[PDB]
Amino acid sequence: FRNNYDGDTVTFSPTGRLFQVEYALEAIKQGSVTVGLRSNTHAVLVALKRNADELSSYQKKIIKCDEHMGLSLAGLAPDARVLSNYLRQQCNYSSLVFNRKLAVERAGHLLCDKAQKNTQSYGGRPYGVGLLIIGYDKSGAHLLEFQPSGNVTELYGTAIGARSQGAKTYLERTLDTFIKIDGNPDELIKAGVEAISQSLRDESLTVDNLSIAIVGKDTPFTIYDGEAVAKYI
Amino acid sequence: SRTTIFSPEGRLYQVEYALESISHAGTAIGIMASDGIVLAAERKVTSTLLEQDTSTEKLYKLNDKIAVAVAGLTADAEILINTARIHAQNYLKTYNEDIPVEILVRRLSDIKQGYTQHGGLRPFGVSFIYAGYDDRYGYQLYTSNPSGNYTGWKAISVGANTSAAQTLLQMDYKDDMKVDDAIELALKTLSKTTDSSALTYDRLEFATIRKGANDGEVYQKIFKPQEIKDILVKTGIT
Amino acid sequence: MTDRYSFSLTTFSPSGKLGQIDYALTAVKQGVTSLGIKATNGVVIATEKKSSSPLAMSETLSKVSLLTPDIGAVYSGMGPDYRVLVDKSRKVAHTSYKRIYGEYPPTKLLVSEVAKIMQEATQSGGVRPFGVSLLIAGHDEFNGFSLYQVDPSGSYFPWKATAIGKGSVAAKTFLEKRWNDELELEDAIHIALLTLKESVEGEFNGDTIELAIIGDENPDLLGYTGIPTDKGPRFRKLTSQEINDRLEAL
Amino acid sequence: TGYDLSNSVFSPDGRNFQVEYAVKAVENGTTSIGIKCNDGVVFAVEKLITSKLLVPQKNVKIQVVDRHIGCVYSGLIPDGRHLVNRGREEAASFKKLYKTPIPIPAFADRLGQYVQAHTLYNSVRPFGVSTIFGGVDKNGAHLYMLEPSGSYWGYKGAATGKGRQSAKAELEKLVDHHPEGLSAREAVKQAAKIIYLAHEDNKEKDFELEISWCSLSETNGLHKFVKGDLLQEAIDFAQKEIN
Amino acid sequence: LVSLMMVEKVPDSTYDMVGGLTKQIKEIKEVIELPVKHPELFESLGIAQPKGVILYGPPGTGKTLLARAVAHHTDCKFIRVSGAELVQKYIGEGSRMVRELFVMAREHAPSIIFMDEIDSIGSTRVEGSGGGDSEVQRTMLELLNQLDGFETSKNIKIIMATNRLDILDPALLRPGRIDRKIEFPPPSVAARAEILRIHSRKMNLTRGINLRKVAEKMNGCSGADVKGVCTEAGMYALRERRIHVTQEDFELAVGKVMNKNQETAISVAKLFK
Amino acid sequence: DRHITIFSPEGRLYQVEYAFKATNQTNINSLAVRGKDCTVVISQKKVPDKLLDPTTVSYIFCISRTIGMVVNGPIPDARNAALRAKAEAAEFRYKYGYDMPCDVLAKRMANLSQIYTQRAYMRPLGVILTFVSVDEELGPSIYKTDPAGYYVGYKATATGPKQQEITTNLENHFKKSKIDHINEESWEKVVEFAITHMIDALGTEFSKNDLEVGVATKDKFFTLSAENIEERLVAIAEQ
Amino acid sequence: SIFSPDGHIFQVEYALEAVKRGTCAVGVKGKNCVVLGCERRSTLKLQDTRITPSKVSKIDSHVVLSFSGLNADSRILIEKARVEAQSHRLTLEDPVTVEYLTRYVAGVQQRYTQSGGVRPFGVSTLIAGFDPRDDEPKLYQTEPSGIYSSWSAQTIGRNSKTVREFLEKNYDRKEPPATVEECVKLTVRSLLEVVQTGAKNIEITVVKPDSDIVALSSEEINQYVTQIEQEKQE
Amino acid sequence: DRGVSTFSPEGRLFQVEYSLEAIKLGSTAIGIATKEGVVLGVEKRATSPLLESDSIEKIVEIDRHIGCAMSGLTADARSMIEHARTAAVTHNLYYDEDINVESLTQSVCDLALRFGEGASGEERLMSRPFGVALLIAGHDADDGYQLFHAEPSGTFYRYNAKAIGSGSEGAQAELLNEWHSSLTLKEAELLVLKILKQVMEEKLDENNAQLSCITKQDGFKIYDNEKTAELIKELKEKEAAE
């Protein structure tokens, strides 16, 4: 009834669990959604924003790392920010030590090597969010998944957080379709947008509650927020 | 028990035990005339075989104008003297003058709460008697405790029923009460508070200060067994 | 690789009664009996080597130890909290005094330099005390013989005679008869053994229990010659036989 | 009861049950093996899919530490990867020294005491992983497995995950059938059999396979994953052994 | 029940069997004696004939042995609870008896009670651990000070007693609910002198007798030790067949107290001076 | 009190009496003797599964060309002690110019165990040890350790769960011939006495693989292999 | 030292009650003068008060302090305050203001709040004095939370509740203290309600410009206290 | 009986969310945006008359052109503003030009996160977190008079206007009802007084509160004790009229 194995991190369960972690991963369940997918040539970020009142501006969900990378998050900003400011150094360091610019997938394989250096020491919590990484290199385009666990995986497209199963289901309904897309990002983008209407608990998206920002085999990272997204609604 | 924090109503958990604990310890008094100084202490044990003869335990000195007494641990006090001794002669290689007390204690006991204040380390199970002289405030007398607050006095006790013993000095002490008129109060201050009214010169320990040498010099005189043994007869014990 | 236990392991009681040393001084009693007596001619110590099995040597175990050429010591209680302490004293007699005034020190100044670590074992953090209370012998050309008992709290008694362990108080009940002032050393072994015979249930042979003494100058030990000035090692330990030569002689 | 709460607290039984709980964490993971062939070693592993959205062949779980090694694991994905990042620099700080590649006993002698160091202190998490490695030195072939209590022994074969009971008795059923010597290529067939044979504890779900070996003969005793028809040759075979 | 009640069989003691105790009778009789001896006298002022009093002090005293004699030379009754018998292994038995108790003395104004021990009704604290005993200390104190107690305090004085003082409920004492207390200390030496005169009345035209020569020596607490040493002194004479007795045969009887005066072994722990 | 290395209420150390019992996880017994100018050491070698490479399994190590040691405990706990040995030989001779004795080097690692009982960041080790060596100044000798620091020589000794089964059996022997060590020269012709004594006293019969051996030869230490043991086992052909 | 769910702190909803035990003292802001006044143990026998640490203390030529609560935790601040005084006179060549060191020590009582294993003080203090090259009085009050204020009168100690409101029947903004004899009459006509004894149980002190510090005898007190011991009659 | 860096089964931390009601003990502190200027307001919580409320300073001046107002626990925030002053001036050096607000204010909310893994390479200062929150107001020449809000959890939002503290849950509703685009400055120099007069525990004085505007023309400005009073009559010019 009262698991004493719920305090600090290192204590395993009597069954092979870290009850801190499993009780953390429901955070993003209490956080919002931000989805993303890719073609063989172009990948996407998406994020509902979560607003305070009828007066405030909005909580942000997307950040650029560098000219050939962006990302999007879920749940917590502040512990999630530093990882953004973190890997900028590990993407500048590339472009100054080498100039052979940064491959995406090792970043995740750097990033997983961070959080694990935060679980097994007294003091310190996990960087308790899920987030989504994008970009392009010589190898084509790639999308990623993140867990504060450390697990990161190369996906076609996925979703996060509350209400997300509705949008999550469109993709398995559609993974035959959107993979064969190229050089025509407009209709691609509205795939998720129609698909994440599956999540709307009657909040009925607007000019400004949505943020989109994508990348290609040509495009540097661009953000479409403010008032440019009358295109899609 | 987390030395730092306070009570739920503005008190401490440990330290009130400490200056209450030291009450278990022996006795150490200290007085002053306008002529000279006396000190005393009753050793916790006065069994016979061991070397009570040269047992210099309760009463140490620091330099050639100062003497003290001790109450508390044998050891946790045994280090402060080696500490404070240096802060005396290290006053001198800067300035070459003699040391005053009123700098010493105010620049000593602040070490105490330094271990109440942080580190999670226990305070010092110790209290002192002080004694000495400067050319600016005359004869002197001071005391201390594990907190750090120090108080000037004319005559004081510690330890067993010191609150009781301090009464015994209340009526009898005199302003111009001379040395040989005041010395007898001490062991008489102890001749009552003793557990063993069966009394032995062995059991106690003694010290003195005067200004005996002409040309204004002084004497950190400390007294041996057979002397105070014969002094003891002077007030008429046997 | 991370230190977080830096708190004190020590605890006040309501009425003083510092806890985890007051528990320590059980094991000092649970340990063996051992003693020490002086006299103007010389000084003696002794213990009882309780060889566990019928297999172990007693040569390997130093239930008595040398500190300097003019000092010995002995314990009761625990051993590994004794072996370490020797070397942390040997390294101190030099690194504070002996390489700095030439001469080796008197006996007590050393004792100021074992309690000054024994204390640190308690008031510091992350530590326990040594579960030991040991004994020192004395010599110097300016203050003479002495004994000095120590203890894990940091105190140090002086003495004229005492003993410790699983048979302590009975000895302290005894020796206050046997002791006196008109004393040489050759007598002191009879009482010391005669004491330590009554407080035993096992064998009582010379090859079972080690002891040692404080004699006088013995240049045969010194190794070299030519300088008539030097004062040789007053400290000395006995053999298997010389014990028994006393025992037959009872 | 009250002693089973933190590292470095022995029992009256004479143990710390916490790592023995770790054994059930690594019990909650994928299947994985590696075989001592006649001239090198083999690696093969289970890799289960949740949704189609997971890409095939971009998410390996083998890791390399240097040229002449392959290593895998099972259970905690990150934690079994950390010590590799310790591995990848250690031997690099050993080829630094006498300018020669590193032995395999050098590996565990430079790892098997590491994880131990994460069971001395009340401030860290025991590496809840079981782990394999292998490769070649001047001496010849080698193989080892690790368990989270630091232990390790030179096997001819191993197994982890919830693919324990199948393979162990199976290899008991193998070895007597073929003790004479099993070359590299042939075990690459017989290995992938076992994983198809061992998924039956979790045949609710699906997966896809991943294999690597290293031969003194074939690849100059270098490490080289599989990517080709040779894999497809084996899956076409391994279905028959379960057929 | 009337077994607790007073006696037609009074004990035979007396407050001149009680040497050394000289002042206390003057300090405590009057509240028990005078205004009840003369209420009109007291009512000339009529300040408050107070409630009971209390006596504290160690054993070795005969606080009991004092309280046996006061029940002689009374003009009043002297009931006894045989302390702590009132409680039983139930709940309802508590308050009824206390209800029965007061009324048993309402019918007798010139009459009083006795406790010996209140160590068993002291220092009530409760968070689930406690007992019904705490329930009864209230109602007695309630019916001590209420609409129906002062009529007893019109009729009554009482006394409590124990040997350990500060281990009970202070919420008990509203001073005025108990208007006076006193120490029964251990004796003086010369106070001890007249004691052995009382009990050793057995010498047989003997001589060389120095009754002062024993409190010469004592540093004890009890007066009863004067009997414990005396009573076994005669045992020597009892065994050696000679009824007579002397000083020295009477003196080494303290050898029995050589244990008591020296049974307290001592620690060698010079942790702190 | 029952989780750390403070002094108990009464004054033992509950976290340490456990550690002796943390050894007995294996049901394993080992043995130590002194030759004439040599020594011997042995222990069971269990193998309850078919797939091992007992080329690899071992408890008996090699620290110099001079000395050796053994373990009856968890080997991970052993290896940290094993490594720290090789170090603490080198730093001795590098500072003094001659090989590492046993009597000293136990007196080091016995000092070391104490400051694992005197602090609390550290887990102690649930092992014990029996070092073996010749000595040019002291001759054939051994030394044993506990996890606390009690270290002592032994003219001959053994360890495991079953000391009582044999340790009496040995003391009965020296009360039959009455000298410290054996009156037989070659190490090859005294190991028979060891294996003659195990199975007979209370032990169980053995095979080729079941046992392992070490010898501190003059200026040489080394293990033994299969036929090197099988031959030495067939000394029983005559007895 | 953390946050409760009631927006409070455990250890500091406690500490400031400690100062509510010990001595009681106060100062004021006169028309053109500033004063303090504090407490002493009468009946403390066999003693000479010349050398005991006064509840008053001085920090510069021209500023002083009066603590309460503890005594040990008071002595430390004066030292490191004195440093800042006779250091601030050096780097900038100008003497202090009043608010500067107050702003300083307002900060140190939280540098000794938010860290590991550090208690705050059983101390509350106030200060007083005139800035250099000015005339307007300045006094500031402190407590362990660091919040430094400017009370025209401020008292911390025993029975202090009505004392905290006693002034409000006595002081007037547009009727400030005329002179010392009344302004010190004010200084004492407050404190005496908790004195309950003669002049021996107190100690006072005063400031005027250009470091015109004074301390007044037990006898000077017995001059004026009589005048209201005479005027506590009609 | 919780700690700092430990989640719950519900995920909602304890201490920081407990740090999100200590503000609700404190005073009131409001600022409202007009496209020609922004206001700031306070409730002194003056407890006694003898006090001289010039010394209590719930309002500050970062520079000649930026100011803020701390609420909740006024003590601790006295530290962090000196951080902002350092980064303001520091940015006034490397570029010879006033800073954008959002370049600053990220720093301040990058400070209070320091109790465990702050920005890149941050040693954990701040055993506990700041038990205080505040409002930032001022111009930079990229977005406009973008007010900013800060709270010690380590996030900031941008607002039109809202409130804090005691009167938070109730007062803002009126503000939510009664703000729009095309209003003046001085209408906001007085509309607050319609509000703060609600949630004061006594009739208003010129000394209970005080105000400070902010303008891209002059810059920063605190008012005087009297120049609040004159507009209160102007409010009573409508309170007496209507």
Ligand SMILES: Nc1ncnc2c1ncn2[C@@H]1O[C@H](COP(=O)(O)OP(=O)(O)OP(=O)(O)O)[C@@H](O)[C@H]1O
């Ligand atoms: N002055 C005295 N006169 C008569 N008897 C005395 C005197 N002093 C001591 N005694 C003896 O003391 C004994 C009882 O005293 P003590 O105080 O030791 O126990 P108590 O009062 O019976 O115990 P409690 O008060 O706890 O019931 C009696 O036997 C009595 O004879």
